[PDB]
């Protein structure tokens with residue numbers, strides 16, 4: 420099977436937000452609205468905002484999953500490459516095979532789907548801190564797009580789903596990801612290509 424990537428705000432007006440980090444050579448994570456694409460360095464913090472129009476119920480959760488963007492690869496599970504799955508860079512919670520981790524959340528849960536074998540990471544959806552209008556999840560991507568025997572230069576999408584306590588769909592959004600050494604340069608390059 421293949422998970423849906425259809426944008427769905429749902430009853431709560433769910434959608435993502437991204438910071439404006441620019442494209443300096445030193446940047447470690449940067450988002451392109453024109454491309455709907457996040458560019459980031461390996462294992463570096465990727466802040467993703469969650470926005471809602473109204474408060475979802477207690478027990479609501481937020482799941483992240485990667486899929487290949489190209490249809491001919493969509494049924495293949497996105498996982499870490501044969502090198503990175505063995506580099507013992509565990510945080511104590513994420514299985515070493517999982518591409519996407521959540522940083523600094525002890526209530527993160529990692530799922531190996533018993534039927535599809537796909538990986539995902541899920542956290543509780545809770546209200547913003549006083550003074551804030553949204554919540555932010557910090558994700559890490561644990562292989563380069565180029566990793567041989569893993570993503571192997573194939574683009575991926577991250578799908579973020581807002582779910583009820585049973586795992587039923589409440590909302591969905593998504594963005595492409597490139598994990599690379601120089602996110603700023605690559606964003607500038609791909610934006611120029613799009614323009615041309």
Ligand SMILES: C#Cc1cc(C#CCOc2ccccc2)cc(CN2CCC(N(CC)CC)CC2)c1O
Nearest residue numbers: 469470471472473474475476477544545546553554
């Ligand atoms: C992102 C996020 C987000 C998540 C939740 C949640 C949850 C589930 O857990 C619960 C735990 C205890 C109690 C209840 C739920 C709640 C709010 C509140 N927000 C205030 C601002 C409001 N309008 C501004 C005035 C939007 C215009 C939208 C909702 C979030 O913004």
Ligand SMILES: [Zn+2]
Nearest residue numbers: 500503562566
């Ligand atoms: Zn790798």
